Ligand binder design. Structure first.
Ligand code: FNR
Length: 327
């Protein structure tokens, strides 16, 4: 029996992995534990319909969960093997995971699982990380030979990205659905999902972060007043194409990047609205290497170490999204 992953350990790893980030904290994943395996499905009811064409970011978010689950399970002593899109007749079935014991859990495994708990999205301005170059080498080693590529944008294109962001908001001015979705998923009365007020920034703070999606403003505040402008390094993660398979890959890559950043004490913030429209995404495409499809931007930098840290954003309980089917 000792080579079969047990429910308690699986569920504990799911509880940890569910810290994964997701578009608007929608957590659009469904899991089924059955016959010793774990099936990962998109939850179509939790797709942000106008915002996220083709459910790309919902699938991406599930990819982030996929990688998180692997990380969580490794720290628990379990290796994971993944079959992606195992059922041509159900494109909502994104992956099936199977498990085998590791011989030992490394310090790396532990630190990476600690990073899952520590990571948060930080929408305040950041300082640039002075030892970026050496860190970029670590990030690239983690991403290996694909399927997700990363471009580090030069400071000389920061304004172009900012203007692509503004263009995106302009194109959404009359998209009522986008605006109602943004309101919905930022309602202050949500408790298990959505973006809480403590995770949002004030109008004044927003003036100081050029690369951002506009969200409803939090109550007035002027945090990190020493930083007149965000100086985060901007990286773009991209894939060969824009299929569901590519979306899933993108999310696994995004998870790897966010966790690597967190393990090195770096602040992160994904920015995706510039990838949600053709016009915007093509602008970002021209900033990156030939033939690559931009999937997500990440701001990477330093937060002030003694800043108070907002509380964790909420997650759904595991019994909302994990089914266990008896043998
Ligand atoms: C695919 C996807 C897309 C986005 C994000 C994430 C992911 C995975 N999130 C961040 C997101 O809102 C955040 O992860 C959740 O609110 C949960 O909060 P924590 O990340 O745990 O702090 C994000 N945040 C942001 O400031 N701008 C954005 O455009 C987006 N969009």
């Amino acid at each position: 029996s000792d080579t079969r992953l047990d429910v308690a350990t699986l569920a504990n790893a799911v509880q940890l992995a569910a810290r994964a980030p997701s578009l608007h904290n929608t957590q659009p994943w469904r899991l089924i534990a059955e016959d010793g395996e774990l099936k990962l499905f998109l939850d179509p009811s939790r797709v942000v319909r106008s915002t996220d064409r083709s459910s790309r970011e919902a699938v991406m978010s599930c990819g982030v969960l996929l990688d998180h689950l692997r990380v969580a399970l490794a720290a628990a002593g379990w290796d994971t093997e993944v079959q992606r899109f195992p059922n041509p007749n159900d494109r909502d079935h994104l992956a099936t995971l199977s498990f085998r014991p590791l011989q030992f859990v490394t310090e790396g495994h532990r630190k990476r699982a600690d990073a899952i708990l520590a990571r948060r999205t930080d929408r305040l301005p950041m300082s640039a990380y002075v030892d970026w170059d050496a860190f970029e080498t670590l990030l690239r080693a983690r991403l290996g030979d694909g399927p997700v590529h990363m471009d580090t944008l030069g400071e000389d294109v920061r304004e172009e990205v900012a203007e692509a962001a503004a263009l995106t908001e302009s194109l959404r001015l009359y998209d009522a659905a986008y605006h109602s979705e943004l309101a919905w998923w930022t309602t202050p009365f949500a408790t298990e999902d959505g973006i809480p007020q403590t995770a949002l920034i004030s109008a004044e703070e927003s003036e100081r972060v050029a690369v951002s999606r506009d969200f409803p403003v939090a109550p007035h505040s002027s945090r990190r007043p020493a930083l007149n402008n965000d100086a985060a390094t901007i990286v773009v993660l991209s894939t060969d194409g824009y299929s569901r398979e590519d979306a899933l890959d993108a999310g696994e890559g995004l998870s790897k990047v966010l966790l690597e950043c967190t393990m090195s004490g770096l602040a992160t913030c994904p920015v995706t609205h510039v990838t949600e429209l053709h016009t915007s995404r093509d602008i970002i495409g021209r900033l990156i290497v030939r033939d690559a499809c931009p999937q997500v931007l990440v701001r990477i930098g330093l937060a002030p170490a003694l800043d108070e840290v907002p509380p964790p954003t909420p997650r759904r309980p595991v019994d909302a999204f994990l089914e266990v089917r008896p043998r």
